[PDB]
Structure 1
Amino acid sequence: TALVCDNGSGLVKAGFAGDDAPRAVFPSIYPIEHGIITNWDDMEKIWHHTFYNELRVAPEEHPTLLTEAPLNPKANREKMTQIMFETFNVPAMYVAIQAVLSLYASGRTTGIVLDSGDGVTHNVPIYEGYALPHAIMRLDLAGRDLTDYLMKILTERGYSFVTTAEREIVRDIKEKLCYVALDFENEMATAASSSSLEKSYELPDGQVITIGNERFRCPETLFQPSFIGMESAGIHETTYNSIMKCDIDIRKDLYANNVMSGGTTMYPGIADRMQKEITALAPSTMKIKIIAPPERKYSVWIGGSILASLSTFQQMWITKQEYDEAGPSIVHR
């Protein structure tokens, strides 16, 4: 049996090729920033924890597939492969791009992915299983950011939230009460006219806070980065631009296959919002389909599982023999 390890900036999703969902999901504590490994010691630690604590396996007995971010430096994956083979004496290993695996989980090999987790967001167009690197769009606005923003504007409402623990509480509030407005201005107006949009949340200390327009002002950032002082464009605009950087002939194939994946895409309404905006941007004769499977917070991992189970995939593994002959570099081929 093979292992599947989706090494995220906020959560590790680990499991066994085969399963419909990862056996283990635990905080990535932060060795990973914005999707890139930046502390190999703490990373070795996290991997060790994964193999020995959460999965309860002998790494030398399992081929292992790890995920990686779009735009991940080759030196990076080389270091990954090395650590895998030398530190954990794994039999075989493979590294795959997250967005791609997301796409695979949806039963596609072509389309554009919006992958947005805790620390980074990507638009990754993909044709016949290959990412079009030149069209990828990184955006350093994600889960953690939206949480911080929530702490700020919540404070502005009168509630103090600033400590690390207070930050975790706010994150809970976010996941449980935030959502994307179909129309931001209209929603703000409604929020001004009544208390229908207002919801209540109980803190651990019993006290019970009330959150209103914040509920959707928060995720609104994903579309209006200026809210947190970013000069960048919104996820809709980046999707669009990404498509518009792709060979025009395949753009239709892209438009008809928007796959959303990751924790920060879980907001109710985001799908529809993206449909409305892309529609407003895209040619009027183009078909737009936004795919947001309920499973999607784990779709990257699932993609991995699926890929790794395919008999036909078994010929893609970098084996310990192959590593022994060729060295880290072999991962690139």
Structure 2
Amino acid sequence: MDDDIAALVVDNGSGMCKAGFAGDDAPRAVFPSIVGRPRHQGVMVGMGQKDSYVGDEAQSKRGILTLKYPIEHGIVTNWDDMEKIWHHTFYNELRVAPEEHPVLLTEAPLNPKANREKMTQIMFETFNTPAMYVAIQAVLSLYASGRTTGIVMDSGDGVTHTVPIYEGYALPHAILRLDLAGRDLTDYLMKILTERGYSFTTTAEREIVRDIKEKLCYVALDFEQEMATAASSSSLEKSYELPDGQVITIGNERFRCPEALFQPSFLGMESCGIHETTFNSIMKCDVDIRKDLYANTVLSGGTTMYPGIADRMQKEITALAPSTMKIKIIAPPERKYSVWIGGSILASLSTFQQMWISKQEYDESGPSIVHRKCF
């Protein structure tokens, strides 16, 4: 391979797919992880009818397209639509030929082997890449936060994971999973805003409520004190202008929504909160490395962009962990992209160029080569 060829880096998020080239400081493209198909025939006469649509183009046509996600809870669920996301990534967003660039992919931890093999087969037989690789999203987040030892709380859209890592070794015996992230939080926000009298049920309204979630919600340091203040004072309420010009006032829902991360009981889930997920994950590791994990607890992914979440997690893990452990949350400003930035760093290193699956090795070995290369 010519040393001047920059590899493509693609982040397979459940909410938004991200894309760019190795060595960039940030992804060049980000778009919803959706493929759309017409709700009825004959609607789009004269507007260039297609069998399906992808990304922003499909998102703006939500009113006439049924929309489906090929990536759900961090796992791929529809491979034709996954190929269409990758097609949109290569040809429509990045505008390059994938057979001319190596491609690095991201995945959820503990991703089933069949999915990895199918990704490998699609990349080498459909897109004919000269090389490709796969890596865990949380691990790339730790790399982007400049670290090789630490535990990452990686929260995208449809799922959260807590991933302890020792000198780059991800540790499956201590990884924990939590089927709860911004998607579930948006549903809960729809619920409590409907209880507030601002009824939101349609597929379009759900995105307005996601915008409210992104702009106005925050993690409070003390849930009880915050509730008391909201009930005794209206200073916590914020105005939001709906697309039709109607202004609605959002109150305690700002923090009741993300609180489900720490107390999943609000959702009816008998599950650990993100603080407990991280704490128990650390406590499943060997005692000697728990101190380093406590000192290097990293938050990553789009769901972690709230205010105050770092402080709340720090408080919770200081209260849970032994007094001897020097707890420290790390929450970078670009942590929504750290998943992808780690791949940029990884794929641009000269010593990493030995780690690829090559087209030759795939032809010699088949998809199972992924179990010998990618982790």
TM-score range, shorter chain: over 0.9
- Following superposition, the deviation at residue 329 of structure 1 comes to 0.6
- Following superposition, the deviation at residue 130 of structure 1 comes to 1.4
| 1:8 is aligned to 2:13 | yes
CA distance in 1, matches of 2:292, 2:325: 10
CA distance in 1, matches of 2:15, 2:272: 24
- Following superposition, the deviation at residue 216 of structure 1 comes to 0.3
| 1:152 is aligned to 2:157 | no
- The secondary structure found in structure 2 opposite 1:238 is helix
CA distance in 2, matches of 1:49, 1:102: 24
Per-residue displacement from partner, 1:267-304 (whole Å, max 9, x unpaired)? Answer: 10000000001000010111011000001000000000
- Following superposition, the deviation at residue 76 of structure 1 comes to 1.2
CA distance in 2, matches of 1:74, 1:154: 40
CA distance in 1, matches of 2:126, 2:192: 45
CA distance in 2, matches of 1:285, 1:318: 44
Per-residue displacement from partner, 1:236-269 (whole Å, max 9, x unpaired)? Answer: 0111000000011110010000010011111100
CA distance in 1, matches of 2:206, 2:188: 10
CA distance in 2, matches of 1:331, 1:286: 38
Alignment correspondent of 1:25: 30
Per-residue displacement from partner, 1:77-131 (whole Å, max 9, x unpaired)? Answer: 1110000000000000011010000000011111000000100000000011111
Per-residue displacement from partner, 1:126-180 (whole Å, max 9, x unpaired)? Answer: 0111110011111001111000100000010111111010000000001000001
CA distance in 1, matches of 2:271, 2:225: 24
CA distance in 2, matches of 1:195, 1:69: 41
- Following superposition, the deviation at residue 13 of structure 1 comes to 0.3
Alignment correspondent of 1:284: 323
- Following superposition, the deviation at residue 33 of structure 1 comes to 0.6
Q: Between the two proteins, what is the percent identity of the paired residues?
A: 94
CA distance in 2, matches of 1:190, 1:232: 28
- Following superposition, the deviation at residue 232 of structure 1 comes to 0.3
- Following superposition, the deviation at residue 45 of structure 1 comes to 1.1
- The secondary structure found in structure 1 opposite 2:345 is helix
Q: CA RMSD in A?
A: 0.6
CA distance in 1, matches of 2:277, 2:135: 23
Structure with the largest fraction of helix: 1
Q: Which runs of 4+ in 1 moved over 2 A?
A: none
- Following superposition, the deviation at residue 75 of structure 1 comes to 1.5
- Following superposition, the deviation at residue 74 of structure 1 comes to 1.3
CA distance in 2, matches of 1:158, 1:328: 53
CA distance in 2, matches of 1:74, 1:97: 13
CA distance in 2, matches of 1:278, 1:101: 23
CA distance in 1, matches of 2:321, 2:243: 46
Q: How many residues matched?
A: 332
- The secondary structure found in structure 2 opposite 1:294 is coil
Alignment correspondent of 1:67: 106
| 1:245 is aligned to 2:280 | no
1:308 alignment partner, one of 344, 347, 351? 347
Structure 1: gaps (5+ residues): none
- Following superposition, the deviation at residue 233 of structure 1 comes to 1.3
CA distance in 1, matches of 2:365, 2:267: 47
| 1:275 is aligned to 2:280 | no
- Following superposition, the deviation at residue 223 of structure 1 comes to 0.3
- Following superposition, the deviation at residue 189 of structure 1 comes to 0.3
- The secondary structure found in structure 2 opposite 1:205 is coil
Q: What TM-score does the superposition give when structure 1 sets the normalisation length?
A: 0.99
Structure 2: gaps (5+ residues): 1-5, 34-68
Q: What TM-score does the superposition give when structure 2 sets the normalisation length?
A: 0.88
